[PDB]
Amino acid sequence: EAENDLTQLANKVAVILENHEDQALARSITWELADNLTSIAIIQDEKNHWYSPNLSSITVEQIQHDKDLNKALKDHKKVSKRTGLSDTDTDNERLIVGVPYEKDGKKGMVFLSQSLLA
Ligand SMILES: [Cl-]
Ligand SMILES: [Cl-]
Ligand SMILES: [Cl-]
């Protein structure tokens, strides 16, 4: 049910990013969708990424260090994985949903990370 709702949300974020000409605006709309347990990491390209502001956050390094997440990122493919993340005190297991998006030829990714309650 976390997957269902987070996968739905991810694709909306995808629609939003893809259908605004102004990405900075599309990001500010997007951040309003992250709840106290969910955070978002938008990765447009190698030099450009942006994090939902403030337990549930995920970095480019945490992604590149997950072989299944990194593959998805590299290969521009959707991924749904449940895992603890690397290099964090908050090693709590999270649901993670990554979804590709494209704008003006700029292929990007939107990763969503949700804290899993015990
Ligand atoms: Cl990046
Ligand atoms: Cl911030
Ligand atoms: Cl520690």
Write down how long the chain is. Answer: 118
User: Using CA atoms, how far apart are residues 118 and 107, in angstroms rounded to an integer?
Assistant: 36
Structure determined by: X-ray
CA distances from 66 to 3, 18, 41, 51 (A): 18, 26, 15, 18
> Which ligand sits closest to the CA of 90?
3
> Which ligand sits closest to the CA of 87?
3
Final resolution, Å: 1.9
Q: 47, 30, 41, 39: which is closest to 92 by C-alpha? A: 39
User: Using CA atoms, how far apart are residues 111 and 73, in angstroms rounded to an integer?
Assistant: 9
Secondary structure in 3-state letters for the chain: CHHHHHHHHHHHHHHHHHCCCCHHHHHHHHHCCCCCCEEEEEEEECCEEEECCCCCCCCHHHHHCCHHHHHHHHHCCCEEEEECCCCCCCCCCEEEEEEEEEECCEEEEEEEEEECCC
- Domain map (residue ranges) of the chain: 1-118
Residue 88 alpha carbon to ligand 3 centre in Å? 7
The string over 43-66, giving b where at least 16 C-beta atoms fall within 10 Å of a residue's C-beta and e elsewhere, is: bbeeeebebbeeebbbbeebbeeb
